[PDB]
Amino acid sequence: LNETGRVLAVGDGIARVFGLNNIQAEELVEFSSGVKGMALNLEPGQVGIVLFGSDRLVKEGELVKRTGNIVDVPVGPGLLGRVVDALGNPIDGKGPIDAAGRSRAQVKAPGILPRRSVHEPVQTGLKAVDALVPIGRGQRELIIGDRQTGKTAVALDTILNQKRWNNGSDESKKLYCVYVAVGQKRSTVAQLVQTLEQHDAMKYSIIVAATASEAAPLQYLAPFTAASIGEWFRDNGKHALIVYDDLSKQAVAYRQLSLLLRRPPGREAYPGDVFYLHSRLLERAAKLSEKEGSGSLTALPVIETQGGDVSAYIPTNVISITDGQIFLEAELFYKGIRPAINVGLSVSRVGSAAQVKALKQVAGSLKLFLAQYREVAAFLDASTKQTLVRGERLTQLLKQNQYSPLATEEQVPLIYAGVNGHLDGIELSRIGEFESSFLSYLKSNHNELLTEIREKGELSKELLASLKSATESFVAT
Amino acid sequence: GEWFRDNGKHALIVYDDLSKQAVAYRQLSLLLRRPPGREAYPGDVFYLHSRLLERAAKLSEKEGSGSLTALPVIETQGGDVSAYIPTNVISITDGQIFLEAELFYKGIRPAINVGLSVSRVGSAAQVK
Amino acid sequence: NLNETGRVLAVGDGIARVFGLNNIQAEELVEFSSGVKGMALNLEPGQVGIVLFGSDRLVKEGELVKRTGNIVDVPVGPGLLGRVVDALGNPIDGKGPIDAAGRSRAQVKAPGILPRRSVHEPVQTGLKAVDALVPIGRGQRELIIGDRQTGKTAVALDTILNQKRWNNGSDESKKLYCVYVAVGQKRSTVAQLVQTLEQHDAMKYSIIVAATASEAAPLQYLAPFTAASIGEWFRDNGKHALIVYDDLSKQAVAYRQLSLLLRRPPGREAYPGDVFYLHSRLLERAAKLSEKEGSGSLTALPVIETQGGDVSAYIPTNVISITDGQIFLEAELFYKGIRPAINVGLSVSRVGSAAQVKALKQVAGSLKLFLAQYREVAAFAQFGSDLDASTKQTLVRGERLTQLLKQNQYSPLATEEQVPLIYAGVNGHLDGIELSRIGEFESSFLSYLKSNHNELLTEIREKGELSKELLASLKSATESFVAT
Amino acid sequence: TPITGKVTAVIGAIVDVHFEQSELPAILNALEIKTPQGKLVLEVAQHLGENTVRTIAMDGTEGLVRGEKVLDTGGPISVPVGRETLGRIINVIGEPIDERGPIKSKLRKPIHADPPSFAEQSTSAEILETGIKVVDLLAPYARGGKIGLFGGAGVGKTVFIQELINNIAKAHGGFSVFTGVGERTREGNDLYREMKETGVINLEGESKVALVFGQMNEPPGARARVALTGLTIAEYFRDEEGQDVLLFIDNIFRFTQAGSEVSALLGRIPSAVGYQPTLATDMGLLQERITTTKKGSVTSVQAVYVPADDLTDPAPATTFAHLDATTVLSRGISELGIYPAVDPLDSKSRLLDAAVVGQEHYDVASKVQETLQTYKSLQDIIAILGMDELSEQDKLTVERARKIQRFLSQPFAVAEVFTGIPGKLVRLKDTVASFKAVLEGKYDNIPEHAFYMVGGIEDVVAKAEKLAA
Amino acid sequence: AEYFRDEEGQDVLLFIDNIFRFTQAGSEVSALLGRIPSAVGYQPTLATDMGLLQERITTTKKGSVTSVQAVYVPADDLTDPAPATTFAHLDATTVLSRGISELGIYPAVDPLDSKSRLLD
Amino acid sequence: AEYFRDEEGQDVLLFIDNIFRFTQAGSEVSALLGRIPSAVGYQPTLATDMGLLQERITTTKKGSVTSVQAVYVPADDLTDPAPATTFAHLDATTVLSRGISELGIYPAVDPLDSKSRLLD
Amino acid sequence: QGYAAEISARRNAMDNASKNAGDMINRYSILYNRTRQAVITNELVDIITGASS
Ligand SMILES: Nc1ncnc2c1ncn2[C@@H]1O[C@H](COP(=O)(O)OP(=O)(O)OP(=O)(O)O)[C@@H](O)[C@H]1O
Ligand SMILES: Nc1ncnc2c1ncn2[C@@H]1O[C@H](COP(=O)(O)OP(=O)(O)OP(=O)(O)O)[C@@H](O)[C@H]1O
Ligand SMILES: Nc1ncnc2c1ncn2[C@@H]1O[C@H](COP(=O)(O)OP(=O)(O)OP(=O)(O)O)[C@@H](O)[C@H]1O
Ligand SMILES: [Mg+2]
Ligand SMILES: [Mg+2]
Ligand SMILES: [Mg+2]
């Protein structure tokens, strides 16, 4: 029984194995029915396996074979455009995966010295995010909010936006994407995949799925294996994005797994280890230095609150890890502000270095302006009236429609007009109309402006004055 | 009561009160080292009151003709119908005669809280 | 042989299971071969659960253990005055050995029903609010309860500092020796306490017992009982003494740790079932002994911290149930400038006016009623509605009285100085001054009486009661002074 | 010959070893396992009997096999100490992680030690002028004292510590030690960059800050012992080199949290809300070593995380007992846009007494707190009925209280990324004068917004002359 | 009290202070006796221990015992399982109230919550 | 309904009344098996226990099983773990109101509280 | 005229009072449900800790 064992007992997803003298901790084991498990507890005389599948598949007295490898997952370009479950089996129905290698599920996060401060943008194509709470490549940016508030919409629009660069040859500007479905309905993942295939985005993204019926260990394991999948891009000098949708359901699955091991419950019945779960998951997102090849892996972890309770245990623990949060409030999603970004609670601790200088210029101090608008709205005085008109029309200006990501070259003129005051000439209800006309105008009259903004990324006084004069030449009619 | 029910006669059984009986079952369960649950009750306390209370019936004209009415009594703490045993019994029963002490002080005796009291089935039986 | 000695089975987290020691008594003391000492708390059919008075790093499996033959005890005598000692009575101030009149067991039976006497004489604290509204009698137990940083230690320390007016005197029946028990505090806090007691030159008559946070859980547990034993020698020899426990909540925490690491079944909030027994057997040792038993008394002031103001918690509930009187410090009142922050509504002294000095009892009689009326009328007025002038009078006088109780830290006032102030508050002739300048009045009024009316102060002190002549004299003096 | 044994069990971060000989390792000794990726260090936690010893792993336990050899080092985890430690980054085990090569120290000392005795404690009062208005006014810090920054998730603790370093660490003549306990790695990298920019570190010359980091990705045992490693460096500077010392810790709550993580695996009955039974005494053993002594002065700033924003949680609750000055940061105040979000009433300090700061400063601070507490009391009435229902005195007090609340905000230079306001550093005497003036009603007229994010009263006047345009 | 009732034939007054302590004491041993703690930490046997105590006190045909017994109410919460279980055994309830005492009104009996069998 | 879908192709309606009692029965079964309870005393493996039921209700190449499930929410609390885990799966909600029935509206579906994922 | 304006202003004030009181009722209803769940969980953890003896 040095390289093999036999099962003593099975129950509630936990199996006890006699033998397996030479098994490593966290090693993978294969049961006689083909289902697989992780060697979690190495007690004297017995091993505690946790099952990556329905426990019906294992019965007492069956033999268990050692795999000889720590829990691992395939990695490489071949996963691109596929759908895989945890442990990386292809579930899309196409042929077997082609892999550049295999990597352990829980490789340690990179340390201090390898990293650089995050100085490149992830262009989401969403006006509110790109302007007020930007995301830098290698950042970890929480997306937090209540049920049905557009969280997946925000992450998915970010994924969809990259098509304008991913078609090029410039690997330094591309951004590959991994999306990790944990606890989601299988139909929801299928429909999301269909959406990605309709917008032609699938060819540069990977979907990792641990659907709602999957055994708890797979839901626990999915984010780690997906992080391993993204780390290959990180480590070979390419740029990756990883969305976790969502870490709350991973926390619930881990709670299940821990309690069935009868480890004592903690605050809110979560185990005391629950911080370490998300911490060692998320710290793997990083940008490496020029010595390491400048790679990065941008994380967008999703969290589902109850009643906007950002003070809950799991939300606070995640916020303690991520560099900032984008808070979506139901009270604004109802009454029609979408994507309903609450700018009061949203912050980006490494954001202001990521923005392209043009957008930072035109968006100057908007994060303070819209916090002052909050003070005005909470309670006419002509000054407060001026700021109130600006606030209402600016919030209208930030609204955006699903699956219509603006390029930054087109975002810049809009925020320019809104901030420098021309939109006082247009009644608010027509602002959306305004945009659809204005941009078309700029796309057919003096495209020079968009070309300069696209290539240079910063506005000289010549560009600044040109944009003033052209926006005046529009707003007059 | 079931003897009368089964032999074609009508009977009415008053359980006074089921919360104290639940406490007794809690004593037995904890001293038998059975797994606890919410408020240290065994999980089976819904099954306990359900198995009791579903015995009240109006049998069809084929199976004799009798009936067994039941009037279980429950003591709330501070009006907390949200409590566990009150929740279970409120779920199992067909309705609710509710009594509020504030009315009892006002001289409104026997203090039926008309608003919260409901009878789903009884309105079909009321005398014309 | 395994009768007088034992062999360590397993050790960790400060607990050592030992084999043998067949003859050892429960709660007995033992010495490990490595020199660390321990206390036996679990006797089981083949194991002894010994808890270590030190770091377990110096104990090793298979080590030998020697029975001491002594249940835990501490030195007692007059030589401990002016010293700092750890839980087991060893000096830690470093000022040399300690002289002892004897030794006493850590835990002892409280005095019974027969030997006791009525709570008969005052503990003058020097705080206007406490001495006027909620007096403490010698032999009483007074829980001081409130949240973090609310002045609890300040109140107890003022009570200690005030005794210098008598402890320097000749009459030992008037003195009061102070024992202070620091449990779970950082050492530098104790260092500042001793520095304060030396700056005021107070600790000629004080004993400091310290079990600081780093010291193992058994010592933090054991400290209050040993300090009680240290005070009981004063009690039994006819000398009045007062113990401050700062604070018993951390002792309860220490016992929770200790019992859990012995793997005894937990109770509510993971405290062991005995957690009520722990404080009750501690606090019943305070007593005023009858004339047959030497008339000495031991008073207790147990401090308690309520998390988030939750007076309903388990340990607060137990200590409230045990002690005779309760003093509640409210965080909110502290910021309003009502400092000390005594919540006079919740606070009560169950010994009552029998313990108060009779002059202060005479003048303070209606103060409590004034404040009780104020608590209603001010709450009504807070809603913004107006009311008849009678409610306005109650409001005004209550506002002045509440402003009158505020007091500077480390400045205790003798009853000869409290009496004029409370007289002016209750009788009137102190309700006309502007609220902001009452502090100017209170400071000046005494400074006036100490020169222009010295005889009245002398009589208020020495005869302790106010005749009609003295009440008329103070009426005249108040009317005369306030007109200025 | 070396004392060697074999692994018998592995569960999470806990590894049990069994020795054929009777020469068992002492508790807290370090053991080595030659895992191919670099030797793993175990720390003995308990003796289980049957010559079995239970240990905490300082690194990932993956790849361990039952029956692997283990060797006793013969002492506790020993870390380098000395002037050579400055300008370097070291791991919990004491190994360099800045890749600049071995630390050439003449001495190496254990991380576990006894706190200094009562005869060695020294007490003195001296305010450390931080340059931050709310701290310098309502909860002054003290040289040689222990300072705590309580706060929830994402409420400004780290920016606060960075501002304190930016102001104090360059002016202070003694050495500094930063001990990142469970902080995010990017924060440590940014700190290293900033300190190289501000000249506090120089690889081609002298340096006067030492760095110890065990980041939140580390397994729980390392996040436990890294704080003690930093304390060891600070102690060596304090006692042997005789220097004044600064000791920054972010975040010390993690030390308690790590304990709970291992506690269940150690075989203990859990305490309230799942914390380890030893929480109070373990925290005490860690925390009492940070003190000042007659040999030298240590000034320590400790960020304290607050789970679920609950200040009553056993860890913060037991942490309050160990600090001279504490400044609670509130999410509620931050959400109002007030930064640094210090709660002006919940913060407290031992130094705020008339004997220390003089009567004027104490009186001004007392009046400020009176006003803010009055404002807090009226919140229900103001919310429900609106401000028009207030009595005239109370309405004036509410206006003044709102102006005071916004006046206490301050733009830190470290926060320029977010404020768009170049940072301002405000002197103590100027702060007292500015608030004294406002309490006297001298600036009733100018609006509420004029006081927001401005340093000193005259800056308020200038911002008023800006808003009047 | 029982011996006076059943042999001496006299009427008896039996005063008890404080019967909460009887419940509370039973809790403290309960943990050490190896019982699982009940709701909010009371012993499982709370109801039947209360009964085995209380139901001995009664006016048999042989004599009369009149019992006045004090009940401590933790945190003033009348719904706490100990007072709540004690109510079932009482003919008259003299509920004293925090509020009435705070008004300066003694003996602080709640005129509404206090009730008696004989008010008929 | 699974047989109808997979072997005859009809679109089938699987009505369930009441799903909360499914969750509650799962909780009781969990407790009797000796499992440590989750938050507010519900079972562990609540999410996956629900998922094994709900995931099977879906469309395929042949047909679909649609499910109309009656939901009871305790204490009117939409945040309780059972209602939350149930809402996580729902595609639409239909809210009937006593007040709307009093207005003579019939079948008394509240048109504004009722909401659908597919109103798109 | 003053009387008419005063009664109209009273209607306005009480309407705003009811609105804000409703908002606070919402907030404290959410807080109450949250606290109830927390109380149940924490009261159950003690029982689980005891049973694991
Ligand atoms: N910008 C937008 N404009 C219009 N509709 C939008 C927008 N963003 C999201 N929606 C709609 O909002 C609804 C919820 O969106 P989405 O599925 O992204 O939410 P979610 O927070 O991820 O949900 P869940 O909690 O169910 O996972 C969908 O109808 C989506 O179409
Ligand atoms: N009457 C008073 N006037 C002014 N300041 C006071 C007064 N009483 C206490 N303080 C101050 O209040 C703060 C807290 O006082 P104290 O040390 O007595 O509190 P404590 O409740 O015992 O604290 P802890 O919980 O830290 O042990 C200290 O600054 C003390 O100087
Ligand atoms: N002076 C300031 N002005 C403006 N914003 C500030 C200021 N100080 C802090 N902040 C805001 O505080 C937010 C969080 O700061 P910080 O990273 O220090 O938080 P923290 O409480 O230490 O959080 P964590 O637990 O995640 O480490 C930053 O986004 C920054 O916007
Ligand atoms: Mg979604
Ligand atoms: Mg104190
Ligand atoms: Mg921080």
Author numbering:
A (entry chain B): 27 to 405, 412 to 509
B (entry chain A): 256 to 383
C (entry chain C): 26 to 509
D (entry chain F): 7 to 475
E (entry chain D), F (entry chain E): 240 to 359
G (entry chain G): 224 to 276
Q: How is this structure described in the published paper?
A:
To test the hypothesis that the peripheral stalk of ATP synthase deforms under strain, we next added ATP to the preparation and froze cryoEM specimens. Despite the presence of a high concentration of ATP in the buffer used for freezing specimens during ATP hydrolysis, State 1catalytic(a), the least strained of the State 1catalytic conformations, appears to have MgADP bound in its αβtight site (left). In the presence of free ATP, ATP hydrolysis occurs at the αβtight site and MgADP within the site is expected to inhibit this hydrolytic activity. Therefore, the unstrained conformations appear to show inactive complexes that are not part of the rotary sequence during substrate turnover.
ATP synthases use a transmembrane electrochemical proton motive force (pmf) to generate adenosine triphosphate (ATP) from adenosine diphosphate (ADP) and inorganic phosphate (Pi). ATP synthases are macromolecular machines consisting of an ATP-hydrolysis-driven F1 motor and a proton-translocation-driven FO motor. The F1 and FO motors oppose each other’s action on a shared rotor subcomplex and are held stationary relative to each other by a peripheral stalk. In Saccharomyces cerevisiae, the FO region contains subunits a, e, f, g, i/j, k, 8, part of subunit b, and the c10-ring of the rotor, while the F1 region includes a trimer of catalytic subunit αβ pairs and subunits γ, δ, and ε from the rotor.
